[PDB]
């Protein structure tokens, strides 16, 4: 159990200072320490308990590995092979005319990231529109852009650590109090590439709808925090960001860059997971990754009454 | 409250802020003279309004983990006075409070001597069955003194009342002793006397019922 | 700008004080106004303001015992404080105040936090917390290197200040008026002093205005040796 | 730290040998596969 209180001079924000007991150790005795938990990771029954307490254990990510995704060849054995098909504007089952093949992939990084798809490969010429069943809602549609967007992301908070022992070898790295400023962490997209992006995106996508018709785009309005947002890594912490900002507009017939929020977990279950959850150890210093946005992941709002809306 | 701070005639002398702060921060330093208004200083942590003399300045707030101080460079007689320092930041709220007072002092101040002017009781104070003899002490530095009122030449005790030495208008100190008498009393002596004693150094005045 | 309070002087405990500051020079309406005290003993006390669309705040340790308005057809700044006790005796001054924003990080994350700092002060006005009534000084001529001394003595009024002038604005210097006494019978009494010629006595004239606004009372007085 | 604790419980977990096991070192022969 978990003794917390706000922070305590929050003008306008969260993140929830607490104390507890904890074992040593020696088994027998004991001791008083505190840390500092984003409140996603905590509930209430001022008492509180982490979240994940009564769904599933959970273990501590070691300090030393790194979460900072690296290019992988996936490969065939010998007398088997991988074709590649190299037709630019390939929508995304058929015949491809221009094949080679190749006994090893490409190097893929391996990505974890929802909604917006991130340092990935571009398609060349048009950008290219891939679903499974176009006139389906149910079935997700895949988007490769031509040209990246730029997104700069940044936990400016001064994170400082300390090392509490709980056991004989274990030890515990909690977040220790911040040290300066209290700001929120976030995400900046250049406007007007963003709005050119969407402005193509948009023309490739009446290909299939007729040609007038009204499009708009809306924010995510289904499912568990965990997948409402565009949730990756950077650095180490795993980011929750809101992308209503970008979502928010109609279509038909200075830098001004858009500043996204971003919330923090540390405790995670990312690909639906439910079991051994993971607790993503403190990070210190600043924090700032700048990434590529390549690809996006849509859907629909369901049956639509076609060339409506 | 007060915090005492002493510095040599000419040198710089440096205030630091009573309060370090948790944020990035927005520190005004006010000068206060015993009995006069307070005079805003710096603003905003290094800004300085028009008329106050470049000789003070604050440290800018640039992120860098540097406490508020007030630098004071060739410090004069004239700088002695409380220093307050308000500190405004991100994570403390509305800051109501100035905080203590630093006291500045200035010092290998010359020592000047006391200048002593007695006057004896009025002639209407003795028709209104009332007579003080009045001793004035002014111009001297340090602002230690020591008044003894004598009669004849064996000292008065009692009667005397006597005002703090406080600093005047050309920087040096200045008191007042009054010695109340009844008339009788007054006709009574050959003479009293108003002796100062200032740094060892001890002068007298002396009046006569006449 | 300038600013000059005026005061009570005395107040009786269990009472409500009140000070009021003339501004000249500057238009009330554009600005943020403000009062401090100084406590004896004490160090200088935010006491709250107001703002241009009239709209108070207050220190939490006055304890909504303040009051703090405005008038602007008489350009006037005023504050009441009721329910006095001796702790409120206090030099009592109004200021200007402006609105800075220290901003540190992006403005909807609200990383920014306003601050005020007093720009323009007033001189102060004393106000006492006390029982007992004005009493008026009587006051007495203290009679005359080349030069004579020459005074007047103040006696045994209540409460402080005493205004001290010369001949209004010709004896200017060498003049002193010295800090007055407090007695112990909790009369004040000061004395005010000029060095003039010896040659000039007898020949000149010199009498000290003295105001005790508080008695109130007035007087003059010829010194003569 | 009259009272003691063990050497190891500040350093590391630690765990028992098992009985039966022996540590007396017998001949072991490193071969190579065939074709090495
Ligand atoms: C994603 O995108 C996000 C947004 O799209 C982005 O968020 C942004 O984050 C950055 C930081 O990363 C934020 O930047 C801050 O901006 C503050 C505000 O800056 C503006 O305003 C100031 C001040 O202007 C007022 O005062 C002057 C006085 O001369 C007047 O002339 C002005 O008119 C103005 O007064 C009006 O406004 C007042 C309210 O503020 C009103 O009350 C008043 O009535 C008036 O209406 C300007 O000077 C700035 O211009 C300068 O900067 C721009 C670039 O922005 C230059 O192009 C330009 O040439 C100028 O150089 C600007 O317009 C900054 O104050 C703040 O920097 C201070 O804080 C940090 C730390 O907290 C310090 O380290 C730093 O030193 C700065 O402190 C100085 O100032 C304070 C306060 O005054 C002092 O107390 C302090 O000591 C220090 O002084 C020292 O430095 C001075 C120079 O700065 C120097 O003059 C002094 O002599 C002394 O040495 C910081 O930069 C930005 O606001 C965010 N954006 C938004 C929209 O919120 C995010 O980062 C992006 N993410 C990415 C990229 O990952
Ligand atoms: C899309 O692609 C882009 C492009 O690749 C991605 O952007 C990159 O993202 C990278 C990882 O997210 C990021 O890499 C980090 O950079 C940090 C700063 O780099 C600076 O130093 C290096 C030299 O080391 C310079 O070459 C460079 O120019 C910079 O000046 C590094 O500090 C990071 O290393 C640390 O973190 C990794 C985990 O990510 C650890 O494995 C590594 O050991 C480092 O951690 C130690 O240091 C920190 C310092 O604060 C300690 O807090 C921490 O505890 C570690 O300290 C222990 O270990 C050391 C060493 O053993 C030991 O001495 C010490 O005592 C402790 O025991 C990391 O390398 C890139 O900078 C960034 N690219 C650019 C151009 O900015 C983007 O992420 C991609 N998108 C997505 C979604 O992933
Ligand atoms: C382990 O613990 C964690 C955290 O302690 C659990 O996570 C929380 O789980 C609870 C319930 O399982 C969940 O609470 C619900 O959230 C829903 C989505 O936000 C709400 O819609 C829902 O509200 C309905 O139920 C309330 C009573 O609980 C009613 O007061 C309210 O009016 C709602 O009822 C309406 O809607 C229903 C359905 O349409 C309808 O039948 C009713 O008539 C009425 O119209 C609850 O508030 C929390 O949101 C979870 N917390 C978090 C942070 O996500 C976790 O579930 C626990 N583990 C296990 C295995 O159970
Ligand atoms: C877990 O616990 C175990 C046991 O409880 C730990 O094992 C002990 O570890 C400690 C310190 O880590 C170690 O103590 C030192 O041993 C050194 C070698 O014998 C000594 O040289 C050293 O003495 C210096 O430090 C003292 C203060 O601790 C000083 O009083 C002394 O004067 C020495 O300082 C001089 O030398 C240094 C270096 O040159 C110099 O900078 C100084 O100026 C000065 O000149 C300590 O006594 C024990 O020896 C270890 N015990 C055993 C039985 O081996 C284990 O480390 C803990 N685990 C972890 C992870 O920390
Ligand atoms: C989040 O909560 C944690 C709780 O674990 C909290 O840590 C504690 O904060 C309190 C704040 O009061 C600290 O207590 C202070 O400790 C200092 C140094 O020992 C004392 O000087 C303080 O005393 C002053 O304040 C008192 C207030 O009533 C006065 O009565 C007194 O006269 C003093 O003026 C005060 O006791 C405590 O030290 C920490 N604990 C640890 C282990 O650090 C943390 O600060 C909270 N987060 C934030 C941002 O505040
Ligand atoms: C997040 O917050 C932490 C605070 O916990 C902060 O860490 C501090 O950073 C500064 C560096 O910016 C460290 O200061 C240095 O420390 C080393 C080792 O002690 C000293 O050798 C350094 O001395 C130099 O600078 C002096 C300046 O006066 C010189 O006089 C001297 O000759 C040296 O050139 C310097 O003091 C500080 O020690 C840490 N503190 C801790 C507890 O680690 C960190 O900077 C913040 N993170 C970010 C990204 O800013
Ligand atoms: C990509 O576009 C091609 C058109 O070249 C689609 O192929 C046709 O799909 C329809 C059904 O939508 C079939 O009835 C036709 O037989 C296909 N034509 C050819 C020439 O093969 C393909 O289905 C599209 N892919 C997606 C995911 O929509
Ligand atoms: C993000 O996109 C930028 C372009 O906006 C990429 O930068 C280019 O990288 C390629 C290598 O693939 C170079 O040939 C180009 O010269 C780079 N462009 C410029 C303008 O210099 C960047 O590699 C992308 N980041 C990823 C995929 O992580
Ligand atoms: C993300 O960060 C990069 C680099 O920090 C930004 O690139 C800078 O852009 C401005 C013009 O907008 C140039 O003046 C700088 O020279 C660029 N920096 C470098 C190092 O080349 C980029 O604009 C940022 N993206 C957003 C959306 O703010
Ligand atoms: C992401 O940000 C948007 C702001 O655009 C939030 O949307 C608001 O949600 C509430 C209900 O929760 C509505 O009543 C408001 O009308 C919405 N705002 C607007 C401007 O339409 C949204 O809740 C945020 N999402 C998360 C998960 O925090
Ligand atoms: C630690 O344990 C003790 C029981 O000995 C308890 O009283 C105390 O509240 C615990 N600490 C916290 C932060 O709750
Ligand atoms: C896929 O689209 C076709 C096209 O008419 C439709 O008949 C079919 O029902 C859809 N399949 C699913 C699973 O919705
Ligand atoms: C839609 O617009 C495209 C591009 O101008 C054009 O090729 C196509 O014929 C249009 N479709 C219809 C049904 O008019
Ligand atoms: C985002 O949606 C809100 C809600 O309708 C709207 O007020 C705002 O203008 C939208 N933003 C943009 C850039 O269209």
């Known amino acids: 159990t978990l003794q917390c209180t706000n922070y305590a001079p929050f003008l306008i924000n969260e993140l929830k200072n607490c104390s507890f007991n904890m074992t040593t150790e020696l088994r027998d005795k004991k001791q008083k320490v505190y840390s500092l938990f984003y409140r996603l990771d905590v509930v209430q029954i001022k008492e509180y308990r982490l979240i994940n307490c009564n769904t599933s254990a959970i273990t501590q990510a070691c300090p030393k590995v790194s979460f900072e995704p690296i290019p992988i060849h996936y490969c065939a054995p010998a007398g088997f092979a991988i074709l590649k098909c190299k037709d630019k504007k390939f929508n995304g089952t058929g015949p491809c005319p221009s094949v080679s093949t190749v006994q090893c992939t490409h190097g893929i990084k391996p990505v974890v990231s929802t909604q917006l798809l991130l340092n990935g490969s571009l398609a060349e010429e048009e950008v290219i529109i891939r679903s499974e069943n176009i006139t389906n809602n149910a079935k997700n549609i895949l988007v490769q852009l031509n040209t990246p967007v730029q997104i700069n992301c940044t936990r400016p908070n001064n994170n400082t650590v300390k090392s509490i022992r709980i056991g004989p070898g274990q030890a515990f790295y909690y977040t220790g109090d911040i040290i300066g400023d209290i700001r929120m962490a976030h995400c900046n997209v250049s406007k007007a590439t963003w709005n050119e992006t969407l402005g193509k995106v948009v023309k490739q996508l009446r290909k299939h709808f007729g040609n007038n018709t009204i499009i708009r785009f809306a924010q995510s309005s289904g499912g568990d925090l965990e997948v409402t947002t565009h949730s990756f890594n950077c650095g180490g912490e795993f980011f929750y960001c809101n992308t209503s900002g970008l979502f928010n507009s109609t279509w038909i017939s200075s830098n001004d860059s858009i500043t996204l929020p971003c919330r923090i977990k540390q405790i995670i279950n990312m690909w639906q997971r439910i079991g051994q959850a993971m607790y993503a150890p403190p990070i210190q210093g600043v924090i700032r990754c700048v990434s590529n946005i390549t690809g996006l992941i849509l859907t629909r709002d369901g049956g639509s009454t076609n060339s409506t809306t | 409250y007060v915090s005492p701070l002493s510095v040599a005639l000419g040198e710089t002398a440096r205030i630091s802020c009573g309060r370090q702060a948790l944020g990035s921060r927005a520190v005004q330093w006010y000068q206060h003279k015993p009995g006069q208004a307070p005079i805003l200083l710096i603003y905003n942590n290094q800004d300085r309004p028009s008329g106050i003399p470049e000789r003070f300045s604050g440290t800018p707030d640039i992120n860098f983990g540097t406490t508020a101080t007030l630098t004071i460079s060739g410090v004069e007689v004239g700088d002695e006075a409380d220093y307050y320092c308000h500190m405004w930041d991100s994570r403390s709220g509305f800051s109501w409070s100035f905080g203590g007072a630093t006291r500045l002092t200035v010092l290998s101040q010359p020592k000047a001597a006391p200048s002593v002017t007695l006057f004896p009781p009025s002639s209407e104070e003795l028709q209104a069955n009332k007579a003080t003899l009045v001793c004035l002490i002014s111009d001297f530095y340090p602002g230690a003194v020591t008044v003894a009122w004598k009669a004849d030449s064996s000292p008065v005790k009692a009667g005397v009342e006597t005002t703090t030495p406080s600093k005047q208008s050309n920087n040096k100190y200045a008191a007042s002793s009054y010695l109340s008498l009844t008339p009788e009393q007054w006709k009574s002596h050959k003479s009293y006397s108003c002796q100062v004693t200032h740094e060892g150094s001890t002068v007298e005045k002396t009046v006569a019922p006449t | 700008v300038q600013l000059q309070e005026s005061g009570p002087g005395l107040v009786r405990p269990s009472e409500t004080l009140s000070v009021t500051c003339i501004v000249s020079?500057?238009?009330?309406?554009?600005?943020?106004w403000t009062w401090i005290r100084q406590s004896p003993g004490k160090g200088l006390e935010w006491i709250g303001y107001?703002?241009?669309?009239?709209?108070?705040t207050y220190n939490p340790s006055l304890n909504s015992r303040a009051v703090i308005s405005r008038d602007t057809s008489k350009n006037q700044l005023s504050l009441q404080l009721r329910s006095v006790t001796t702790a409120d005796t206090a030099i009592y001054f109004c200021?200007?105040?402006?609105?800075?924003?220290?901003?540190?990080?992006?403005?909807?994350?609200?990383?920014?936090?306003?601050?005020?700092?007093?720009?323009?002060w007033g001189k102060g006005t004393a106000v006492t917390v006390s029982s007992a009534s004005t009493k008026g000084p009587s006051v007495f001529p203290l009679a005359p290197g080349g030069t004579a001394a020459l005074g007047c003595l103040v006696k045994d009024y209540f409460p402080e200040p005493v205004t001290v002038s010369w001949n209004s604005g010709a004896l200017t210097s060498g003049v002193h008026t010295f800090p007055a006494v407090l007695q112990s019978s909790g009369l004040y009494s000061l004395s005010s002093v000029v060095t003039v010629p010896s040659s000039s006595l007898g020949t000149q004239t010199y009498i000290c205005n003295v105001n005790h606004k508080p008695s109130n009372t007035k007087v003059d007085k010829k010194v003569e040796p | 730290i009259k009272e003691y604790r063990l050497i190891n419980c500040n350093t590391s977990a630690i765990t028992q040998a098992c009985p039966k096991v022996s540590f007396e070192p017998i001949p072991i022969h490193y071969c190579a596969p065939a074709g090495f």
């Open positions: 200021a200007t105040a402006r609105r800075g924003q220290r901003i540190y990080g992006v403005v909807s994350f609200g990383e920014f936090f306003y601050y005020y700092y007093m720009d323009v």
């Open positions: 020079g500057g238009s009330i309406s554009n600005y943020y």
């Open positions: 107001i703002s241009d669309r009239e709209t108070t």
